[PDB]
Design a protein around this ligand. Structure first.
Ligand SMILES: [Mg+2]
Ligand SMILES: [Mg+2]
Ligand SMILES: [Mg+2]
Ligand SMILES: [Mg+2]
Ligand SMILES: [Mg+2]
Ligand SMILES: [Mg+2]
Ligand SMILES: [Mg+2]
Ligand SMILES: [Mg+2]
Ligand SMILES: [Mg+2]
Ligand SMILES: [Mg+2]
Ligand SMILES: [Mg+2]
Ligand SMILES: [Mg+2]
Ligand SMILES: [Mg+2]
Ligand SMILES: [Mg+2]
Ligand SMILES: [Mg+2]
Ligand SMILES: [Mg+2]
Ligand SMILES: [Mg+2]
Ligand SMILES: [Mg+2]
Ligand SMILES: [Mg+2]
Ligand SMILES: [Mg+2]
Ligand SMILES: [Mg+2]
Ligand SMILES: [Mg+2]
Ligand SMILES: [Mg+2]
Ligand SMILES: [Mg+2]
Ligand SMILES: [Mg+2]
Ligand SMILES: [Mg+2]
Ligand SMILES: [Mg+2]
Ligand SMILES: [Mg+2]
Ligand SMILES: [Mg+2]
Ligand SMILES: [Mg+2]
Ligand SMILES: [Mg+2]
Ligand SMILES: [Mg+2]
Ligand SMILES: [Mg+2]
Ligand SMILES: [Mg+2]
Ligand SMILES: [Mg+2]
Ligand SMILES: [Mg+2]
Ligand SMILES: [Mg+2]
Ligand SMILES: [Mg+2]
Ligand SMILES: [Mg+2]
Ligand SMILES: [Mg+2]
Ligand SMILES: [Mg+2]
Ligand SMILES: [Mg+2]
Ligand SMILES: [Mg+2]
Ligand SMILES: [Mg+2]
Ligand SMILES: [Mg+2]
Ligand SMILES: [Mg+2]
Ligand SMILES: [Mg+2]
Ligand SMILES: [Mg+2]
Ligand SMILES: [Mg+2]
Ligand SMILES: [Mg+2]
Ligand SMILES: [Mg+2]
Ligand SMILES: [Mg+2]
Ligand SMILES: [Mg+2]
Ligand SMILES: [Mg+2]
Ligand SMILES: [Mg+2]
Ligand SMILES: [Mg+2]
Ligand SMILES: [Mg+2]
Ligand SMILES: [Mg+2]
Ligand SMILES: [Mg+2]
Ligand SMILES: [Mg+2]
Ligand SMILES: [Mg+2]
Ligand SMILES: [Mg+2]
Ligand SMILES: [Mg+2]
Ligand SMILES: [Mg+2]
Ligand SMILES: [Mg+2]
Lengths: 210, 147
RNA sequence: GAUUGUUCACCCACUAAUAGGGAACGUGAGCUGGGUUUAGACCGUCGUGAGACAGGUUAGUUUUACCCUACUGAUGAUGUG
RNA sequence: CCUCACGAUCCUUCUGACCUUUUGGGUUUUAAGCAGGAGGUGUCAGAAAAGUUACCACAGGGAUAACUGGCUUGUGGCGGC
RNA sequence: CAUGAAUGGAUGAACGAGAUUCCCACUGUCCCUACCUACUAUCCAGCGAAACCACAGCCAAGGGAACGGGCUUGGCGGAAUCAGCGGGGAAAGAAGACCCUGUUGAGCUUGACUCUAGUCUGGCACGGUGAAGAGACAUGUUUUUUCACUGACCCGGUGAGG
RNA sequence: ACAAAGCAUCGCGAAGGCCCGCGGCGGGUGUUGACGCGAUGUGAUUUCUGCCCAGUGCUCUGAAUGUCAAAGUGAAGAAAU
RNA sequence: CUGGAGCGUCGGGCCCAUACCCGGCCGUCGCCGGCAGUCGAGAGUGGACGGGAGCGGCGGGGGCGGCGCGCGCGCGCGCCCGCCCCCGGAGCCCCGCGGACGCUACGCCGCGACGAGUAGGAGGGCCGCUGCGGUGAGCCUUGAAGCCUAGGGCGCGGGCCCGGGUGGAGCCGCCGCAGGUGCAGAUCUUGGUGGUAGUAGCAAAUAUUCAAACGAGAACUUUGAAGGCCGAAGUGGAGAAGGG
RNA sequence: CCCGGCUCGCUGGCGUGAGCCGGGCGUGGAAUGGAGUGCCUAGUGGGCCACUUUUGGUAAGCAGAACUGGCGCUGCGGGAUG
RNA sequence: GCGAAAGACUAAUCGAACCAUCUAGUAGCUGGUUCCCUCCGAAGUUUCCCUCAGGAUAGCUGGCGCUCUCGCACACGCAGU
RNA sequence: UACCCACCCGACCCGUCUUGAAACACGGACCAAGGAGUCUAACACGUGCGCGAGUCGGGGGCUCGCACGAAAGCCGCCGUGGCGCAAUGAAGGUGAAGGCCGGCGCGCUCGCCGGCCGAGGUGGGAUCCCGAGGCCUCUCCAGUCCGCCGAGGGCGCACCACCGGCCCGUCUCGCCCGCCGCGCCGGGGAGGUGGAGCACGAGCGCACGUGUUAGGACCCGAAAGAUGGUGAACUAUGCCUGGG
RNA sequence: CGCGACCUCAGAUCAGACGUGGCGACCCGCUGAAUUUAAGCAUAUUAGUCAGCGGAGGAGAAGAAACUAACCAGGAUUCCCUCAGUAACGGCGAGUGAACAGGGAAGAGCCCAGCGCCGAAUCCCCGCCCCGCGGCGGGGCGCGGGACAUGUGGCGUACGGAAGACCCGCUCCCCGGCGCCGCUCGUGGGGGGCCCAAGUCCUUCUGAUCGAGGCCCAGCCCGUGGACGGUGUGAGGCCGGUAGCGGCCCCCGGCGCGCCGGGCCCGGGUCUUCCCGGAGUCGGGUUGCUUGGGAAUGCAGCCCAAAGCGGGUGGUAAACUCCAUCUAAGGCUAAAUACCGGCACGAGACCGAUAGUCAACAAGUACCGUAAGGGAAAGUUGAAAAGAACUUUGAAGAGAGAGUUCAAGAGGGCGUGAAACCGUUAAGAGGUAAACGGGUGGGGUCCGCGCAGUCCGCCCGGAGGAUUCAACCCGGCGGCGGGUCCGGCCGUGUCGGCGGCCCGGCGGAUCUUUCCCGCGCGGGGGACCGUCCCCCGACCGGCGACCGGCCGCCGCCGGGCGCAUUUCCA
């Protein structure tokens, strides 16, 4: 029974919230259950980036979100034959392989290749055995470190480049940026209809001829 | 807390702030937003006008990401960029005009509210207003589009 | 007294008269239960029917007093050494 | 000549604009909008709805009856001028 | 008002703890009552419960929730009790069984609304073989009527015996 | 009151009547066959059983030019159609 | 009750409410309240400081008067000239040099004014119950909680505080926080207890009596004797199911 | 109130009319009392009685309005009681 | 389910058992609703209601407030006049 | 003040529903103990505190065997987002800005170009500022200081009333167009109206009060409905087997 | 009228396996209401929930796209935040009501069938030995069986793979044993056992102390231990314990070297030839349930039923038509993730025995119903039974003495021990039932007193009696206040130093890649502004921020002052 100005309210408690309520007095003991994993996993895999394997730079999808960047799932395949890394080797070398990405542009390809090129260079391949041959990095580059990378390997920060102030040529200063949007949005509006008339008018040039 | 309630002050108080003529019975009206057409009408019609009925057109499955488009007013661009980049210029003598990626500060569209300081600018944005156009032009400086 | 569940009536009879009324329409832990007015039944009518009917008819459990009171009796009581 | 002589939501139809949507683009159907008109709720601010229960039940009710009682006295009875 | 023919009408011998009515005999049914007995009650020894109770409990009238025990004015009142008694405590028993209302039900009914199991019919499916032959359209297709057949399918019998 | 014996209708020749079950090639009548089974009506004996097929039922080798889905076949279309 | 205690019209006099007056006391609201250290009562300024001078003055209305006058300016002293001096002292009703006892600055104080209440609100509760963080060199085997008290008191009162006894182990005060928080009621729940009341009642089958035994104790047990009943379709003698 | 002046796309032979700017001018019957305005919002939404007015009814302690006054809701002196 | 038929009976239960759960079922309807004091303090009135035992909104109430005036010799406003 | 007693006046039994209860309405023998507005979500207003065109809070991370700890601290997290920072339209989308001056286009209350100022005005508006004139001050004058009074004048927040303005929708009307392109392209005006709009901001976070719902929902309080199970030990029938 | 293969199908108490019930919080299939809600009501909702039923495990399901998207794109699952209580559904009403993007926990990927390649390269079960035997396994050897040609092994599986040619570089894993070496985080992995400080010191309370003073620093000791419980009261010290990379002994776990027995010739990169998708499935029509899915989101029955530049999808039917994105019909999987059942623990703003679970105890017990089922009440002596020996009355129950006890007015249903209620003792009352309000009066029990309550406190005057002073200086000590801001130190506002600026940092999308390092970007350095420090100089608030001297005053201590003073007493 409402009385004099409120909202409507469709609170959804007609069902049976009561039985299926989860309270959260786990929350802090869970925090700790978790702690001990983060903790244990690291001490188990001693020299290995604690965070996890290396994971690619990647762009967020839908239109609003565009300008952001992420750790993606894993680096593409096309990406690797280019960096010269075999896909099944990568998986052993702490390089994250999604094999399910349609690579569309050279911009985000080489951007993401440089991460592998970077990785190779600052990676100490700890050799199969102690008395081991090629590709494993030398006993100097080996003593120096026992270093787990705390935090995400080569963390991906959204970084922009400053544009210095300009002069504004009398040409940037003529472009009516509103007008040209309305143009755009009407040519894209009617591109299709306009094309039907060229198709009819091209029909009349043949139909007038016969 | 319990202590600071009226129910404390309503002991020995028989009906309990609730009236002994018509008692506090369970659910006199109905249950919740119930009787909107019938008999609770006078609220709904005088206090929430335009509740009962359809209008408009479905857009069904709908996603906001598709039509994400924040707004900024000219009013405050001379915030977005560190105030020193304005004090630098307004001065400088070359007609520098700093660039303002209304993109980079987080806005898919720029709109013509407020004064703008007499100061040439390059605003790179998405969907400009007209008036935003005119004000920036009429100040000096330009309107660059971004995709 | 005859009839009648009846209040109500009518008649026979006697006498002196066979006046009229009230008391929760006096009076169910006074009775009876004849009539109303449960549940079973029957005919009349109405209803398509379940069923209805101040339309008839027959069968249908009628509690408890010891408690204060009133009353009827019975002991008694303070007073008069 | 004035005062009555008509009606929401949701639903349906007809009309109107070189209208908007029909959605990864485009063209045609089709559908949805938008804005006006009609279908209609006679319980008229708008429920899509027959009975019976003496086989009955529960919440209630002296806000609703059947006795008793009060007032009233039409009628009844009784009595005056 | 308002009977009546298998919603049976009309009769009727026997029978009915079935309903009436009248008569003889009989009878404490009554005039109108009376007495006698047994068990009680009663009194004692022993054992000893309940129902109910706001406080309680003498009345008239006034008023008064329009019939009060209270209160006003009156009437008046001597401790504690026993057998009785049913006038009163609208006594108790038992949130009235009568009646109204509720958007509270149940049981039943049908011409209520909305549906259902079931059954009838049509379609489609397992769902074939052969044979005749006909019409309609067209200048092969479709519709297929009818009659067989037995491999599915169905029913019959036995210890599957010709 | 019911039943009752007696009278009366009615469906049924088993790929059936009536009937059960949730289901099967499920089950009862049925260890049956119309003198039986199932469904009703009235209510011994005697005498009788009047007229009405206008309603609603039931039913009938009955026309079904009344309508009537699905599917089925006809057509336009580019397809939903 | 009767030239009335009747009824008309009228006097005086008196009687009485929570009504009005005055006072007393306890509430609340307001006072642009005062009171966080200051002059001043229809307040109608105060002060430098100069030049000049002095008994001047400000020689204005039966106004009755209000804004100007008769406690002084100047004066007493130092001697016409100086002064007209310092509260760590004027001696103080004004004191501005520093401020209550009073000033928990949500304290206290004066005015006035006002304080019928169901439902409801609101406020106020050193009103009450139980829990925790603080805090009370809290209290306690020299006796806590509860309990009990015709032991002194206090609040308007929720309650609170004090007097004794008994009890035997723990308890409270403030500042906060936290509640399953305060009962007379719901034919409320559970347990207990009255009145009724020493009340109803121990009534179906005709039936007992005597003597002895045993026994603390006998109408009631047992034995004997006597009277009785069931009365073979039994209260007779055996079984089932049940019972165990 | 009273002067001066401007504006207009309305209105008209012109003016009206309306709107503005600028100036000029004070207690405008009695009596009373400080005024204004914004949120939340409970109970309530069966009422009853009196004077007077009044409709049904014959009349009611009957039924229904007006107006006011009560009680509810709130005692007290009186109205013996209420 | 069972009924020689009477709504009979189904283990003190029948107009159709008992047991547990859904289950805090729902209730415009009965009953109750627990410490003090201070202040203000009703309505039974409005329109819509499947509305007449209830709601919806009109009122009236409190609280919370705020804008100001000036009783600080130096007020405008308001009003059951 | 309390116990008993005594007197004089007063005086009906509470609770409740109720126009009206001592009710010849109902609950209520008495006593102990238990006992009914609770929690959560969502709103809303009121208020408290933090920060403020931000502000948060998680959920995550980094820091513990916790004694205290399932605490506290800290994080480009800190904003990936909510809320707010702008609305309006059904939708494509548009989007809060005006004044003035000069110049240029015929100022055609139409178009464009350079400068100046920036949220338009009126009336109320707490009100701050200025203030003519008093009003003293031992004399006549002179005069700086100091307050009180102060007619009159200026800025004027907050708020209220009004008049103006700008965004979007829709209408009407009517002008000129730009021209990556062609206008069934896009674009610009005037007037009116609809908008929960802008017109130099007030939210955010966290408390608590109230309220309103959703929630069992203040407690107690049905006749029913559903889902699953157990029963013929009574009785009803049928059958089987016994007896009279 | 035979014998023999196979195919189908029987029988075996055959040889060897295994399945079945329970538990059931969490987990998965299905099934499935009605109360309830809508002020009715059937639509809707409750709600795919309860019951019913089926099924699993230490977790369950799912999972490597026939996905997402419309970006400049992402990339298995699940989970938390978030979207967001939003897109839509609905007598568009009650309600209902998801998703896409981002952030974060965790994060792992993989396997079949077919096409083909490869003497079935395979697999199963026997017998003899060699090792191994408390999860039955390797090694060998056997014309010892059998499946399998209707098809068993390897590579391979779409992210390409196979096969070829030449381009490059070069060889360690697996498993059965059999040893051994490092006990391998709470801060020596799990478990068990066993073990590790300090007072019963004085005195005094008390029945008993654990209490109160004290005891070489709050006393003595210990204190990586002062949690807790026990212990005839409150105890760090008495005792168990507690703390404490404290000790030691078994066992168990896990990981490191050796030996051995077996297994394995397993790479990388280039050019060509060819080779490819899982049928009564997709899809469609229909109906039925479901959600939110819609002119059909999901699931169903039936009917129809495909293709291979195909198919699905790309969320209002449809044709055409353009674009994107997966690849079904086969399959597995840790991790986060869930847990009212179990075992085992830890805690609390909790309840505290009519509360708290029905259950503190013989509790799912007693008892009830035939049965499904229903289902209670009931804790406490004291510290110790020290629980009344013995005399006596009494048939006996009960008493009186006595005894025990700190206490029996703690006596075996015993702490305390209320009210109703009843028990008797004392006082007073008593014809209008009691009971109540106002006002007094009498009497009692107690309570204050007074064997004068004359209540106190100043000051003063008088008369007695008694100590050292007060007033004064001087020595010392300590305050206070004042200022000269005198001297110094301190900080506010200003100025100067451009002096910290690089020996002062941090912030800024400021600027230079003239710089340096690493790969136009990242890191670093260098320039700039805003900020915050030194030097000194000047002004001013000169501030509770002092500190030094000088002053003025006060107080205390010690000297002086012996008495017309200054105290005490009456
Ligand atoms: Mg991670
Ligand atoms: Mg009240
Ligand atoms: Mg009530
Ligand atoms: Mg007679
Ligand atoms: Mg009578
Ligand atoms: Mg009787
Ligand atoms: Mg009687
Ligand atoms: Mg009778
Ligand atoms: Mg009858
Ligand atoms: Mg007849
Ligand atoms: Mg008939
Ligand atoms: Mg005409
Ligand atoms: Mg589409
Ligand atoms: Mg398309
Ligand atoms: Mg009948
Ligand atoms: Mg009545
Ligand atoms: Mg009444
Ligand atoms: Mg009457
Ligand atoms: Mg009676
Ligand atoms: Mg109604
Ligand atoms: Mg019904
Ligand atoms: Mg019909
Ligand atoms: Mg017949
Ligand atoms: Mg006939
Ligand atoms: Mg016929
Ligand atoms: Mg009051
Ligand atoms: Mg609690
Ligand atoms: Mg209580
Ligand atoms: Mg006999
Ligand atoms: Mg025998
Ligand atoms: Mg009412
Ligand atoms: Mg009436
Ligand atoms: Mg009957
Ligand atoms: Mg009522
Ligand atoms: Mg009465
Ligand atoms: Mg009642
Ligand atoms: Mg939101
Ligand atoms: Mg129902
Ligand atoms: Mg199992
Ligand atoms: Mg209801
Ligand atoms: Mg309903
Ligand atoms: Mg209903
Ligand atoms: Mg439904
Ligand atoms: Mg559902
Ligand atoms: Mg749902
Ligand atoms: Mg279930
Ligand atoms: Mg996903
Ligand atoms: Mg200890
Ligand atoms: Mg201890
Ligand atoms: Mg020890
Ligand atoms: Mg499928
Ligand atoms: Mg559904
Ligand atoms: Mg798959
Ligand atoms: Mg799986
Ligand atoms: Mg699994
Ligand atoms: Mg107990
Ligand atoms: Mg218990
Ligand atoms: Mg006890
Ligand atoms: Mg006890
Ligand atoms: Mg004791
Ligand atoms: Mg004791
Ligand atoms: Mg003890
Ligand atoms: Mg005791
Ligand atoms: Mg006594
Ligand atoms: Mg006595």
């Amino acid at each position: 029974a409402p009385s004099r100005n409120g909202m409507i309210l469709k609170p959804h408690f007609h069902k049976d919230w009561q039985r299926r309520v989860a309270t959260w007095f786990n929350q802090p003991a869970r925090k700790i259950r978790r702690r001990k994993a983060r903790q244990a996993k690291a001490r188990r895999i001693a020299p290995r980036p604690a965070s996890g394997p290396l994971r690619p730079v990647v762009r967020c999808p839908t239109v609003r979100y565009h300008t952001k960047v992420r750790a993606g799932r894993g680096f593409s395949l096309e990406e690797l034959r280019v960096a010269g890394i075999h896909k099944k080797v990568a998986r052993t070398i702490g390089i994250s392989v999604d094999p399910r990405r349609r690579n569309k542009c050279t911009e985000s390809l080489q951007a993401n290749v440089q991460r592998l090129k970077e990785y190779r260079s600052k990676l100490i391949l700890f050799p199969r055995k102690p008395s081991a041959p090629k590709k494993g990095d030398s006993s100097a580059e080996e003593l120096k470190l026992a270093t787990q990378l705390t935090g995400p390997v080569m963390p991906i920060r959204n970084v922009y480049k400053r544009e210095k102030a300009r002069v504004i040529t009398d040409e940037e200063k003529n472009f009516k940026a509103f007008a040209s949007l309305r143009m755009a949005r009407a040519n894209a509006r009617l591109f299709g209809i306009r094309a039907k008339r060229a198709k009819e008018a091209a029909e009349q040039d043949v139909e007038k001829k016969k | 807390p319990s202590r600071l309630r009226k129910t404390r002050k309503l002991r020995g108080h028989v009906s309990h702030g609730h009236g002994r003529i018509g008692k506090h019975r369970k659910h006199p009206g109905g249950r919740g937003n119930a009787g909107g057409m019938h008999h609770h009408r006078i609220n709904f019609d005088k206090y929430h006008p335009g509740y009962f009925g359809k209008v408009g057109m479905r857009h069904y499955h709908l996603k906001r990401n598709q039509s994400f488009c924040p707004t900024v007013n000219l009013d405050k661009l001379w915030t977005l960029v560190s105030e020193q980049t304005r004090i630098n210029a307004a001065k400088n003598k070359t007609g520098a005009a700093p660039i303002i990626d209304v993109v980079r500060s987080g806005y898919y569209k720029v709109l013509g509210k407020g004064k703008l300081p007499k100061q040439p600018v390059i605003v790179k944005a998405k969907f400009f207003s007209r008036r935003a156009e005119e004000k920036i032009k009429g100040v000096g400086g330009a309107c660059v589009l971004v995709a």
